[PDB]
Design a protein around this motif. Sequence first.
Motif, PDB file in Angstrom:
ATOM      1  N   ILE A 110       4.431  -4.763  -4.910  1.00  0.00           N
ATOM      2  CA  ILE A 110       4.156  -4.031  -5.987  1.00  0.00           C
ATOM      3  C   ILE A 110       5.480  -3.858  -6.648  1.00  0.00           C
ATOM      4  O   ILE A 110       6.361  -2.927  -6.139  1.00  0.00           O
ATOM      5  CB  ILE A 110       3.558  -2.606  -5.646  1.00  0.00           C
ATOM      6  CG1 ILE A 110       2.172  -2.870  -4.966  1.00  0.00           C
ATOM      7  CG2 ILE A 110       3.274  -1.647  -6.710  1.00  0.00           C
ATOM      8  CD1 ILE A 110       1.337  -3.681  -5.483  1.00  0.00           C
ATOM      9  N   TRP A 159       0.837  -1.219  -0.062  1.00  0.00           N
ATOM     10  CA  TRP A 159       0.077  -0.079   0.234  1.00  0.00           C
ATOM     11  C   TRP A 159       0.783   1.267  -0.030  1.00  0.00           C
ATOM     12  O   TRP A 159       0.544   2.140  -0.637  1.00  0.00           O
ATOM     13  CB  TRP A 159      -0.882  -0.051   1.331  1.00  0.00           C
ATOM     14  CG  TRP A 159      -1.579   1.063   1.450  1.00  0.00           C
ATOM     15  CD1 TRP A 159      -1.551   2.081   2.525  1.00  0.00           C
ATOM     16  CD2 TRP A 159      -2.761   1.832   0.660  1.00  0.00           C
ATOM     17  NE1 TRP A 159      -2.383   3.217   2.470  1.00  0.00           N
ATOM     18  CE2 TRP A 159      -2.997   2.914   1.205  1.00  0.00           C
ATOM     19  CE3 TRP A 159      -3.308   1.592  -0.640  1.00  0.00           C
ATOM     20  CZ2 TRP A 159      -3.945   3.964   0.917  1.00  0.00           C
ATOM     21  CZ3 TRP A 159      -3.929   2.468  -1.037  1.00  0.00           C
ATOM     22  CH2 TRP A 159      -4.713   3.575  -0.459  1.00  0.00           C
ATOM     23  N   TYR A 168      -0.622   0.907 -13.020  1.00  0.00           N
ATOM     24  CA  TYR A 168      -1.723   1.110 -11.865  1.00  0.00           C
ATOM     25  C   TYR A 168      -2.488   0.147 -11.971  1.00  0.00           C
ATOM     26  O   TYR A 168      -2.985  -0.284 -10.800  1.00  0.00           O
ATOM     27  CB  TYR A 168      -2.558   2.379 -12.275  1.00  0.00           C
ATOM     28  CG  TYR A 168      -3.966   2.414 -12.073  1.00  0.00           C
ATOM     29  CD1 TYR A 168      -4.310   2.527 -10.871  1.00  0.00           C
ATOM     30  CD2 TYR A 168      -4.946   1.963 -12.871  1.00  0.00           C
ATOM     31  CE1 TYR A 168      -5.707   2.531 -10.402  1.00  0.00           C
ATOM     32  CE2 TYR A 168      -6.155   1.872 -12.703  1.00  0.00           C
ATOM     33  CZ  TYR A 168      -6.777   2.169 -11.241  1.00  0.00           C
ATOM     34  OH  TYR A 168      -8.057   1.960 -11.206  1.00  0.00           O
ATOM     35  N   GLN A 203      -3.863  -5.906  -5.137  1.00  0.00           N
ATOM     36  CA  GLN A 203      -4.204  -5.653  -3.774  1.00  0.00           C
ATOM     37  C   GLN A 203      -5.523  -5.866  -3.434  1.00  0.00           C
ATOM     38  O   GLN A 203      -6.242  -6.281  -2.380  1.00  0.00           O
ATOM     39  CB  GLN A 203      -3.869  -4.288  -3.370  1.00  0.00           C
ATOM     40  CG  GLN A 203      -2.429  -3.881  -3.229  1.00  0.00           C
ATOM     41  CD  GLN A 203      -2.402  -2.447  -3.222  1.00  0.00           C
ATOM     42  OE1 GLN A 203      -2.144  -1.899  -2.183  1.00  0.00           O
ATOM     43  NE2 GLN A 203      -2.087  -1.829  -4.361  1.00  0.00           N
ATOM     44  N   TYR A 249       2.227   1.731  -3.415  1.00  0.00           N
ATOM     45  CA  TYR A 249       1.039   2.029  -4.247  1.00  0.00           C
ATOM     46  C   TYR A 249       0.813   3.461  -4.175  1.00  0.00           C
ATOM     47  O   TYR A 249       0.771   4.292  -5.085  1.00  0.00           O
ATOM     48  CB  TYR A 249      -0.285   1.436  -4.050  1.00  0.00           C
ATOM     49  CG  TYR A 249      -1.620   1.506  -4.824  1.00  0.00           C
ATOM     50  CD1 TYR A 249      -1.475   0.846  -5.906  1.00  0.00           C
ATOM     51  CD2 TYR A 249      -2.569   2.205  -4.216  1.00  0.00           C
ATOM     52  CE1 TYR A 249      -2.726   1.008  -6.766  1.00  0.00           C
ATOM     53  CE2 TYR A 249      -3.609   2.462  -5.112  1.00  0.00           C
ATOM     54  CZ  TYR A 249      -3.898   1.954  -6.237  1.00  0.00           C
ATOM     55  OH  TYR A 249      -4.824   2.078  -6.962  1.00  0.00           O
ATOM     56  N   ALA A 283      -1.132  -3.181 -10.393  1.00  0.00           N
ATOM     57  CA  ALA A 283      -1.112  -2.910  -8.780  1.00  0.00           C
ATOM     58  C   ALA A 283      -2.079  -2.795  -8.024  1.00  0.00           C
ATOM     59  O   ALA A 283      -2.267  -3.460  -6.975  1.00  0.00           O
ATOM     60  CB  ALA A 283      -0.141  -1.457  -8.521  1.00  0.00           C
ATOM     61  N   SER A 284      -3.126  -2.402  -8.468  1.00  0.00           N
ATOM     62  CA  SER A 284      -4.639  -2.348  -7.910  1.00  0.00           C
ATOM     63  C   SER A 284      -5.231  -3.438  -7.833  1.00  0.00           C
ATOM     64  O   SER A 284      -6.013  -4.007  -6.907  1.00  0.00           O
ATOM     65  CB  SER A 284      -5.648  -1.279  -8.843  1.00  0.00           C
ATOM     66  OG  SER A 284      -4.984  -0.118  -9.066  1.00  0.00           O
ATOM     67  N   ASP A 316       4.646  -3.350 -12.193  1.00  0.00           N
ATOM     68  CA  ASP A 316       3.299  -3.113 -12.522  1.00  0.00           C
ATOM     69  C   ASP A 316       3.015  -1.691 -12.745  1.00  0.00           C
ATOM     70  O   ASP A 316       3.284  -0.710 -12.080  1.00  0.00           O
ATOM     71  CB  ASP A 316       2.717  -3.381 -10.852  1.00  0.00           C
ATOM     72  CG  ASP A 316       2.765  -5.011 -10.287  1.00  0.00           C
ATOM     73  OD1 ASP A 316       2.614  -5.717 -11.356  1.00  0.00           O
ATOM     74  OD2 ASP A 316       3.029  -5.092  -9.214  1.00  0.00           O
TER      75      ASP A 316
END
Length: 310
Positions: free
Chosen positions: A287, A4, A293, A300, A7, A296-297, A291
Amino acid sequence: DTAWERYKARFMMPDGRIIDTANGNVSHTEGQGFAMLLAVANNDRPAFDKLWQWTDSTLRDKSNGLFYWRYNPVAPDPIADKNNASDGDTLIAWALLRAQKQWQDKRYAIASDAITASLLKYTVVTFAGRQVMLPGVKGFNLNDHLNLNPSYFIFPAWRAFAERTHLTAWRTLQTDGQALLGQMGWGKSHLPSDWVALRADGKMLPAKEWPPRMSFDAIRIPLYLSWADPQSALLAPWKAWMQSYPRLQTPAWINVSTNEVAPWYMAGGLLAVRDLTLGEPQEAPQIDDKDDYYSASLKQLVWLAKQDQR
């Protein structure tokens, strides 16, 4: 956790925008809603309030209580498209509901309630004998057809809404959306495409206006199905299709009309959805610089979906 923090470092701006750095650095309600969900999951109230404050002040559509779906910071008008995206509105309202529980503040739930009431009033219609959520208030209601996106049937959000408010209407929408999804599927994979045209007699086909692929929208369907109920029979075509490929050689999309598949393979966030769908054990996400966006999203969200099975 570390995923996180990485991110936010790569994709969150100090003003609260999440940046789709692979798509021209734009922001959208999917991105804000995803990040708001992950901010709750990581117990990060400062980030949540920044994300929500930017979303509300910048993207709120005051005529109906929903949100302009896209923000382009280099455009002369950064909010040129005045339509909403119903999955983004849903994710935002769902994150707000979860924020109330996490931080014990009813103001987040009061905000959620306005959005969910707006979703029922402006995006849910009666069509082909069922309640259906349009992808947006305008542009998807063709006369005897609706252009639907089944990856906007966010089943775990709808269940959360029903526990809070308008229980009967949200439960009916969930019942009807599972039933419609159960009727979708084309070609030898029996999978749905990103966009599906629903005719007023109930007949469905991949929508005319888009490539008829199971691709970057549709892959969220097994995520949302497994998030709500890993025992769902609606997961059956997803498991069957993924089980027919090596884990590291699963095509990133399939044309469900012609059965043509992508010549390249799921990795990163897409691969995390594959692992979730098949129940293959996976550790907490990392991440990497490879990766984008989107990946990466998904990494998670898959982890959060697993955690919510508690």
